[PDB]
Design a protein around this ligand. Sequence first.
Ligand SMILES: [Mg+2]
Ligand SMILES: [Mg+2]
Ligand SMILES: [Mg+2]
Ligand SMILES: [Mg+2]
Ligand SMILES: [Mg+2]
Ligand SMILES: [Mg+2]
Ligand SMILES: [Mg+2]
Ligand SMILES: [Mg+2]
Ligand SMILES: [Mg+2]
Ligand SMILES: [Mg+2]
Ligand SMILES: [Mg+2]
Ligand SMILES: [Zn+2]
Lengths: 108, 152, 219, 115, 300
Amino acid sequence: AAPKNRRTIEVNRCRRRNPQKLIKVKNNIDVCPECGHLKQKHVLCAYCYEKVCKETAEIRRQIGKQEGGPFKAPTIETVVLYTGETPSEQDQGKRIIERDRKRPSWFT
Amino acid sequence: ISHGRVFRRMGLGPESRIHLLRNLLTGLVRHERIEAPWARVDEMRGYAEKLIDYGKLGDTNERAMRMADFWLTEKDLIPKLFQVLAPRYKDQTGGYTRMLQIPNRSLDRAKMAVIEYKGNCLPPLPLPRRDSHLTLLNQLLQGLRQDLRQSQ
Amino acid sequence: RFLSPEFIPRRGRTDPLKFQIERKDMLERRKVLHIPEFYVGSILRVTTADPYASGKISQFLGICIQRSGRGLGATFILRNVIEGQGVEICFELYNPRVQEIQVVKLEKRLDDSLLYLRDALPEYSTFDVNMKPVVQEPNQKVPVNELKVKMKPKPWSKRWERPNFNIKGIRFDLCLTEQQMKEAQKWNQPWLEFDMMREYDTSKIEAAIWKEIEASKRS
Amino acid sequence: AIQKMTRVRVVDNSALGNSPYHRAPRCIHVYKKNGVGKVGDQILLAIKGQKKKALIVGHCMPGPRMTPRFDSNNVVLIEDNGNPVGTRIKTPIPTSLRKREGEYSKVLAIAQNFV
Amino acid sequence: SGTWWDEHLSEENVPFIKQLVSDEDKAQLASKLCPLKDEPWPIHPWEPGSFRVGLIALKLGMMPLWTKDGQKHVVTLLQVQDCHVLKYTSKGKMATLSVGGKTVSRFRKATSILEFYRELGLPPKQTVKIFNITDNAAIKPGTPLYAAHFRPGQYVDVTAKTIGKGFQGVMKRWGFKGQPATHGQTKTHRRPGAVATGDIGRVWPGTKMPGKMGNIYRTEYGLKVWRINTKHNIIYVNGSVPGHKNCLVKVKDSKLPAYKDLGKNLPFPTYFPDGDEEELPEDLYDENVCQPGAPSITFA
RNA sequence: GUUCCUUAAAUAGGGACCUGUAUGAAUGGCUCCACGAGGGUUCAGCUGUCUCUUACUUUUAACCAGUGAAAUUGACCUGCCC
RNA sequence: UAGGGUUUACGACCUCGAUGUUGGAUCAGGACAUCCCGAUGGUGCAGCCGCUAUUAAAGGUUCGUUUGUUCAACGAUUAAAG
RNA sequence: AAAUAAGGCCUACUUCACAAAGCGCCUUCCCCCGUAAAUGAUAUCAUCUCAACUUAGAUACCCACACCCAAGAACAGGGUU
Ligand SMILES: [Mg+2]
Ligand SMILES: [Mg+2]
Ligand SMILES: [Mg+2]
Ligand SMILES: [Mg+2]
Ligand SMILES: [Mg+2]
Ligand SMILES: [Mg+2]
Ligand SMILES: [Mg+2]
Ligand SMILES: [Mg+2]
Ligand SMILES: [Mg+2]
Ligand SMILES: [Mg+2]
Ligand SMILES: [Mg+2]
Ligand SMILES: [Zn+2]
């Protein structure tokens, strides 16, 4: 069980230098059309994902401020708006949740 | 051996994993977006598929009511579910949940993904937009199709 | 309009061509004999033909304990204590040694598998060998003689007290006690009842099977 | 099914099998290359502190499809030539033994009922 | 491989390309459906020493089959899909012939394979099993081989992979008895005890040890055929067959000494639908097989 | 040990013989009411201990991230047969 | 007259600043002075049952009751429990 | 027809379920040197050859990014119309 002979530096090098253990190079790094932050295939961007996360967090904070206490969950849909923008004539009963913000160049 | 085996073991047993999946489904029904590992993400997506199916079956049905009361621990999401996610998708059949992928976690580096119901009021996600039709290969294929059509 | 449980395939992935060929063979076989539809707990009487017996024609009576299998395999055990001796024969509806499949009754007994009859006293097993049929109410709800079954002393062979079996027929009040019922319920799994992923849908498959049966009957 | 040390239930008119005893008679040895007994096989049976041959007439495990399955290890006694000891068997006997005709002829003639 | 095709295609060219691929494959199959009409090379009669080309079917499932004597006999399922010849090579030790099977998409393949399959008709297949045939029977490439190649009452061998159980232990890999549960084991229940002797400080090559079970080609000899189907091109072989369901299997004539000189009634080259041959019924039965629909048996 | 049983086999258990030649009496000889985690057998039930083992959950194992020891080592470019 | 170091010893030649002691479990490698499946000669070979000498080790070599003991007694098997 | 050891399978039977396993089912094929016999000399008899010459005397598997997997610890492999 115990080492009968210490491994030589040559053996150690040959063990810790073969291609099987070396980090395999990858070639799945493209250029994201948005903000060019070199994204990966089959994976979303980084800056766009952070922006979406921040927007969702702000929307959730606004909903909580409007909803109030916990244990609510109304049975009505939601509609997000921005500075100005008259509410859509189709969504009149849906509770509107917004505050102050400008529509970015990627939100419908 | 695991030939043709479904349900990947997660927690310390069936009860733990099903409770975790139920909690994830409740969180998604409450917020419509969760960042969870790929395995748990796909499991919760498959569960929410049947959940929406049951919700669409009908509200007066005692089976669907019991399923909604069980799979939802808060007990406040059952009406929202039944009255929003069932009538909104009255035209679809099985086009729910949109799964993607997250780069990785900044802590232990884990494969995470995102899933959400279509038509949500939240901002849109950067879906993988295919190449435009005005490219070289697309134009060549369009010309080939036009020639094949004119051949008749 | 109930569809025999032999046509409904299993969830196992495979080529539908195999199931189609199996259904075609089953229909071609049924075209000869009759093979009436029956549920669990119903008394049956299959007249088979054996190569060595008092006459090439054989007979036997019993209650269908259960039934499973797919394709040409439609097994069903027939229970009938004769001369104070338990006997069980595993017959298949798609055998060449079949002539007549007479049905005496049509019951369900709630439980879809009367495998606990082996542990039950002989009173709920002995039946007449030359009994007459009992038909009534054509095309109507099948009767269900909802009745409990007393069990022998504690020495069993399958632990029917646990809830995983789900019988809803054994009379545990006249056999088991409070501690036994508690120890049995200890191994409960309420999550299985709510597991909506284990259910195997069959609406489209049932419609396809009915369409194929109609096409085969009309041609 | 009927291997070594198995409480065998005898069913014959022989006084040795019908008389009671303070020890249940169980098999002795299986006359087969393998350690498993089936229908139509000779086996030694200890009865009343004495050794005597027997014959397996039905087991408790599930056999082939077109065959029965008893709930008790039914066994019938037999001598050297056999030449069965008993004279009447009220319990049923599977028809699988009828294919013998030569090895156990008198046993079939004495058999009353059949499955 | 290189970059997968579905990368630079918009949301309108994918279905068009799929339909074009399907139409091209169907047209090639329809054009190759006529072997006799095209140069089929001279056909020779049956000879004492000569073999024929085999088939490559798909193992669907299993089902029982009772004979006229009233006995259960397990039977397998083999679907003969397309099954075309690729090329022919003369003298190695004997002539050879390549045969395909299923139709695999021509997108995830090597450029050399794509060029080779473009030189000939039909689309690229999955596997390519080479059969050791004699110089007598020599079929031209591009011809089909349906299930009619074989006939009932014939022993046909089959070989294919097996349900690999991965790097298994010892008991499941070789059937070892392991160690008891008590008296007085503490950590020994499935491990291998002694290796081999003591003084020998080596290990006998080939000694039974943990390894990758299954996942290897294994042939089975002695498998009788009961019934065959012409419409769906199915072959029902007796006994099980190596390989999981929906797995390609190589089938060819047997090789036992008692079954070698009996192909006089069988087609020496291969079945030819175009004839000048008299088509066969929906499915040929056997002399000792209960037909579907025949009256019940009776041993009286 | 002889001797009769207890089972299919009994150097396991027990009924009597002194021949224990070195047993034998408050260095205590014998029976007995209740009892023994003390040491050896057994009748009707019991379980995977085996006949022949298999399926599932966890502990646990492998990979991806972090840290991170000890027993030990003359150097090894370390095969096999006579 | 030739072969054995498998039993009992005989000698203490490195191994008491360590080679962990028998049976019983999984696994068996090899040798034939071969129990059996293959082939021969003789025989106190009318045939089986037998005996002897040569080749053939590709294969097989049981289930249990006791004493801790391989060995040691016994019940039933198959051609054999080397 | 049964077992032995090996190669496979879940459609019927069971442990059980989207699998796997056996109690359940299919397959396993080549002679082995030890003898007995034509024809004649050393030894014109006779005689089987450590004298010349004749009798019982290889077949099988193979060699063109990303999702799922009956393939797999990774790696690797199969499918992705
Ligand atoms: Mg875990
Ligand atoms: Mg074991
Ligand atoms: Mg242990
Ligand atoms: Mg660890
Ligand atoms: Mg690490
Ligand atoms: Mg140390
Ligand atoms: Mg010395
Ligand atoms: Mg020493
Ligand atoms: Mg010392
Ligand atoms: Mg030392
Ligand atoms: Mg010798
Ligand atoms: Zn971006």
